[PDB]
DNA sequence: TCTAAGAACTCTGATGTCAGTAGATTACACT
DNA sequence: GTGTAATCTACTGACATCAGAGTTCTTAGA
């Protein structure tokens, strides 16, 4: 969606900014409609819900006797819905306003807390705005800082704080926005460290072994002397196998009437597996691994094959 | 931990003292067979600890005693027995109020221990040195009644 | 520590005539200070760790109630999960009229004996049934010598306190306030785990923080397999989660009871009741309808046995930050499943960090789930500030995106800037720096929701109406930057808006 | 008292003993409702709570003095509402008072 | 009798303050009550106990029905319903005046409480109560139809219902048909569809681990259900086929099942209702018979008890089956009469396995007479000399009679049951053996 | 002269998870 | 058979999470 927004910095430097979504975990378009057997009509089923008090199974009237509560320790506050809209934290609106600027390493790769990654571009046909944004972008780039902007899709949406990363491509410079955590969201854990490995002790035989490994299985290696490594596993251009399986299933279930489902088409598996050459390179290094570590046992589970014939 | 301690003390009283604070603190937590073992550890050394009556009412020893579990009851009445000479009367009254309950109980061994308790009460409180302690008089009366 | 275990904090205030009415000046009051502390920490714990345990018990009082019927100790509310019906009780005492009520209900402050007081608190922690993770006792007194008079009481005190130290209980007092008499080497250097008249440690116990926490809970343990034969035991842990508000519960008008939703599915043609077997899933493509078994509608996803599938390794420049998909997770071996695997994990970690390259893998978090491609970017530990864990050592999980995600952008042309305005924008961007710490900000929504919750819970006169750093401080930007907005207007802006 | 039956209340506050407010109502049999829906007659509160501030911010209810119901208990007969007996009113009562009161 | 004082105190425990503390006192008080009044032996004092336990102004049932709002008494409810379960056995059928109230208590508890720990026993008590009060007219006043309504509804609450409570739910839906078929007349087919379908899902799985205990409950409920409302020779290729192939699936331990409820219950299903499946038995005869014998010797005593009954029914149904038609020759003269014959004639197998083997030699006396009369007398002979060498062992104490001549007499009965003539020359021997058994 | 379709976000409800607890089941075992 | 172990499998609290459903906004629009 062409979302335009006013990139706000200060109280007097508004810029029309066009927001665009870059990466979103795609969800299949239309849900599996629930249908009754042996009649195959959608309209024959009602997922009706009923609310019943615990005493003697008294049924309570559907949508005007229930008022939502919350747990606050032992007891339940009778909150409501009307009180909800009366006390909910308001907001002005889009309010994509820059809180400040900070160093690259001041934010870290790990901490990104987003649902989705926006791309933050200029509202079209206002050139001076575009160059203004471009100035912004280069300046952040060479000075190697990032921006932290209050974000909000709109009213009735929770506000949002995160990094504004600035990006460059020979066709165009780019600026992208990601959720970064609020404090309540961050978690903290001890995680007893490892360089106290008085119980694990990675001996040099193991050390140089793993060296040989991670070199040997190098999924990427430089090509064309341009340092464009052998990234013949981009994973970026690779279709989501989930959707592949889903459309395949729908197919075989259409082209045939009732027949049992097929296995995964071997080209999908070939697709997901690494290009063979890595597997070819892999046997000897792993081979030396198997004699250089302890590998005490583990467990396993079952299926319908637990009692399925053949 | 309780099991280990019990097995230790079962032939060695002295070691208990060093851990008996924990023995008590852990008491009300457990339920079931381990309770028996815990109170047994308590028994092994009950003859020495001072201010045991307070510490013992801390955990609901009175309510602990009422439970239908023969071994738990046997160890509880034995606890009563040993701490008998040391406890002041004003509270031996409250402590015998549930001991007297065990007249109706069926575990023959349990009743034998009851009558031992009440024997001792009767022997050592007959005609107290002072009549003012209405507590003492009442204890004597109740003991006599149940023993009859 | 044992997860089901819980953190328990008992509260214990000096109820003598000592500080009930010290009020040297007319700005605070030590009892009104301690009660404020207790109310504050308790409401903080309500939201924070609603599962924990608290208890409040005063000592030296004239009335009496405790488990053991001792003298001058009063257990205000026993150890129980926090709840409103208790904040109410504490609040009943906050105030000059409140302190009149406190004194005329339980006592002005009689004689006491901290030996016995600690006895009381000990019995309290004992009485609870659930398991206790940490056990902590907070005195709120100031008589920095509990008693210089009867030393025997003092010997008994040191003895029992050592015991409590040995029974697994810690103890801590914050020296509240005393004219002079603001020392801990007088009788407490051997109790708690230089000195002044007010405690910093009690300041933060008013900071009034209200997030929530969960312990070291493994999100899922799966076996990273290098190949079809080598496997290691990894615990997929989580390090950022986007706490949504606690899910509301449905209640009846007339009685505030739970209402036990009872959704069901049933027939329209007849008043029948479709049992779960008697349903079918469906789609509509190509004007033709489709049927699958409800079992099949999830069988259509079985792709790999659960775990991690490391394939190769990849130069960290190539794992572009430009394509985040979901919050990252963390990787750290769990010695429990495949014994010794922690070694190999460490080996991979050390070597990869040394040779500055990623590790790509297939992630099947649970059964029935399609796999995604995630990279095991290693992470070095950092401790420098105070030698406390900051970034835990191991591998990240940067999920790599799939082709169905790129969302082809509506191409537009570029217009470079002139070095003049970018040279000034250098100054602009320099001026508005600020160091960004991780926990800088808060959700206004979550925070305000929690607030309004306490508001409705405690029958307050007002909501707290928190002010939250999310909104920018406008005047600050107007000032610290100067009027450069008109500079960039005259540089790169014509009349039109 | 067989009068307050078929009349449904809301004792939203009251701490005069609040839990005894509805008890006194109970031997009079007044229908006791914890949270006022569109059905209820009026709402009774011995002070202001934030929910009171809500139901003020949504005029869909009639909000009453503490003393009024006590008087109706001391009339042994329901006393239909009067200007002092209220501390806020609903729009139906306001349009009724646009007939029934000087402004 | 201290039952009265103890009970009196129990209802006191309801109103004490520290409810989370009053709970423990109450719980082991009620345990004491149970221990006291299950031991009782005097047929007088026993009545006093009973009428105090099910008392009204107080008593265990009122304690439940009134301590049911609180959650602090989960353990107490659990023990009180367990003690009802034991009592119901201890005074079978005497509780007759209180059955209706017990049923109302059971259904009340099942509706109210949350934690399974109280639901499991709750359903258990209904199971016991129904199973013991079958005959009496009391059955009509449990309003069993309403019970079927309520629990059938329970079967559809988004399947949140936990596992073991679900297995007992299926148990009761089953045994409900058995106790009072008349009220189920218009509801049975629905329930069959339910059990069949849910069994299918739960055992013809694709991804989910088999909720074993759920399955055990399912098929045992099916067993109880087939007692009436038969399902053979009517819609067999659908209905009976599904039931049957599920039974096969249950029997087959396609992996070594460390737990035994599923096979045990399956064997019982087959045992008590092979009469339905008689048609399809011959389809899989080889597999069935193999699996059963192999199954006849695992250590679990209950399982062995299931297995023997299963084999007995299998052989019996097969024997009945052949007695009608002449194509299954390539069945007996290819598999049975040789495999069990080879058992007897070679093995050093178990005593029990030998007994079932001799049985098998017998039960096929029918087909023997259908196919060739001249073999009937021959097998009669062979059996009676087996007898003659198994009784005249010259006082072999403690080993030989132990499990055998019961079997042989069973067998000789079987064979004579179809002998045309009488080998009178051998006859006196037979009654000599009969006396020996006596 | 304006009415749907997608969008998007949030919210709710199940599914599956993990640690813990403890029960009942099943193996072991008695000369 | 009888009785005591060992130990698997359960349930629950609790926490993530897909999906599913309720809701506002742009274009194409009588």
UniProtKB/Swiss-Prot annotation, chain A:
Modification Phosphothreonine occurs at: 291
Residues annotated with Phosphoserine modification: 11, 14, 74
Ku domain span: 9-208
Coiled coil ranges: none
Glycyl lysine isopeptide (Lys-Gly) (interchain with G-Cter in SUMO2), cross-linked positions: 288, 290
Induction record: In osteoblasts, by FGF2.
PTM text: ADP-ribosylated by PARP3. Phosphorylated on serine residues. Phosphorylation by PRKDC may enhance helicase activity.
Record-listed N6-acetyllysine modification sites: 21, 88
Record's subcellular location: Nucleus; Nucleus, Nucleolus; Chromosome
Domain notes: The EEXXXDDL motif is required for the interaction with catalytic subunit PRKDC and its recruitment to sites of DNA damage.
Family under the similarity heading: Belongs to the ku80 family.
Misc. remarks from the entry: Individuals with systemic lupus erythematosus (SLE) and related disorders produce extremely large amounts of autoantibodies to XRCC6 and XRCC5.
Summary of the function given for this chain in its UniProt record: Single-stranded DNA-dependent ATP-dependent helicase that plays a key role in DNA non-homologous end joining (NHEJ) by recruiting DNA-PK to DNA. Required for double-strand break repair and V(D)J recombination. Also has a role in chromosome translocation. The DNA helicase II complex binds preferentially to fork-like ends of double-stranded DNA in a cell cycle-dependent manner. It works in the 3'-5' direction. During NHEJ, the XRCC5-XRRC6 dimer performs the recognition step: it recognizes and binds to the broken ends of the DNA and protects them from further resection.
Protein name as it appears in the record: X-ray repair cross-complementing protein 5
Origin species: Homo sapiens
Entire-sequence positions represented here: 245 to 554 of 732
Curated annotation (Swiss-Prot), chain B:
Localisation: Nucleus; Nucleus, Nucleolus; Cytoplasm, Cytosol
Domain of life: Eukaryota
Post-translational modification as stated in the protein's UniProt record: Autophosphorylated at two clusters, the T2609 cluster and the S2056 cluster. Autophosphorylation induces a conformational change that leads to remodeling of the DNA-PK complex, requisite for efficient end processing and DNA repair. S-nitrosylated by GAPDH.
Disease: Immunodeficiency 26 with or without neurologic abnormalities: A form of severe combined immunodeficiency characterized by reduced or absent T and B cells, recurrent candidiasis, and lower respiratory tract infections. Some patients show dysmorphic features, severe growth failure, microcephaly, seizures, and impaired neurological functions.
Family note: Belongs to the PI3/PI4-kinase family.
Assembly and oligomerization: DNA-PK is a heterotrimer of PRKDC and the Ku dimer (composed of XRCC6/Ku70 and XRCC5/Ku86). Formation of this complex may be promoted by interaction with ILF3. Component of the core long-range non-homologous end joining (NHEJ) complex (also named DNA-PK complex) composed of PRKDC, LIG4, XRCC4, XRCC6/Ku70, XRCC5/Ku86 and NHEJ1/XLF. Additional component of the NHEJ complex includes PAXX. Following autophosphorylation, PRKDC dissociates from DNA. Interacts with DNA-PKcs-interacting protein (KIP) with the region upstream the kinase domain.
Organism: Homo sapiens
Gene: PRKDC
Swiss-Prot record, chain C:
Keywords from the named record: Acetylation, Activator, ADP-ribosylation, ATP-binding, Chromosome, Cytoplasm, DNA damage, DNA recombination, DNA repair, DNA-binding, Helicase, Host-virus interaction, Hydrolase, Immunity, Innate immunity, Isopeptide bond, Lyase, Methylation, Multifunctional enzyme, Nucleotide-binding, Nucleus, Phosphoprotein, Systemic lupus erythematosus, Transcription, Transcription regulation, Ubl conjugation
In-chain residues carrying the UniProt-annotated modification N6-acetyllysine: 2, 280, 294, 301, 424
Residues forming the catalytic site: 2
Top-level division of the source organism's lineage: Eukaryota
Effect of residue 135 to A: Abolishes adduct formation
Glycyl lysine isopeptide (Lys-Gly) (interchain with G-Cter in SUMO2) cross-link, chain position(s): 250, 280
EC number: 3.6.4.-, 4.2.99.-
Record note on what altering residue 131 to A does: Abolishes adduct formation
GO CC annotation terms, alphabetical: chromosome, telomeric region; cytosol; DNA-dependent protein kinase complex; DNA-dependent protein kinase-DNA ligase 4 complex; extracellular region; ficolin-1-rich granule lumen; Ku70:Ku80 complex; membrane
Residue ranges of the region described as DNA-binding: 240-304
Modified residues (Phosphothreonine): 418
Similarity remark: Belongs to the ku70 family.
Remaining remarks: Individuals with systemic lupus erythematosus (SLE) and related disorders produce extremely large amounts of autoantibodies to XRCC5 and XRCC6. Existence of a major autoantigenic epitope or epitopes on the C-terminal 190 amino acids of XRCC6 containing the leucine repeat. The majority of autoantibodies to XRCC6 in most sera from patients with SLE seem to be reactive with this region.
Name used for this protein in its record: X-ray repair cross-complementing protein 6
Source species: Homo sapiens
Residues of the full protein shown: 30 to 534 of 609
From Swiss-Prot, chain E:
Modification N6-acetyllysine, positions: 112
Post-translational modification: Autophosphorylated at two clusters, the T2609 cluster and the S2056 cluster. Autophosphorylation induces a conformational change that leads to remodeling of the DNA-PK complex, requisite for efficient end processing and DNA repair.
HEAT repeats, residue ranges: 283-318
Highest rank taxon of the organism: Eukaryota
Function: Serine/threonine-protein kinase that acts as a molecular sensor for DNA damage. Involved in DNA non-homologous end joining (NHEJ) required for double-strand break (DSB) repair and V(D)J recombination. Must be bound to DNA to express its catalytic properties. Promotes processing of hairpin DNA structures in V(D)J recombination by activation of the hairpin endonuclease artemis (DCLRE1C). Recruited by XRCC5 and XRCC6 to DNA ends and is required to (1) protect and align broken ends of DNA, thereby preventing their degradation, (2) and sequester the DSB for repair by NHEJ.
Involvement in disease: Immunodeficiency 26 with or without neurologic abnormalities: A form of severe combined immunodeficiency characterized by reduced or absent T and B cells, recurrent candidiasis, and lower respiratory tract infections. Some patients show dysmorphic features, severe growth failure, microcephaly, seizures, and impaired neurological functions.
Protein name (record): DNA-dependent protein kinase catalytic subunit
Organism listed in the record: Homo sapiens (Human)
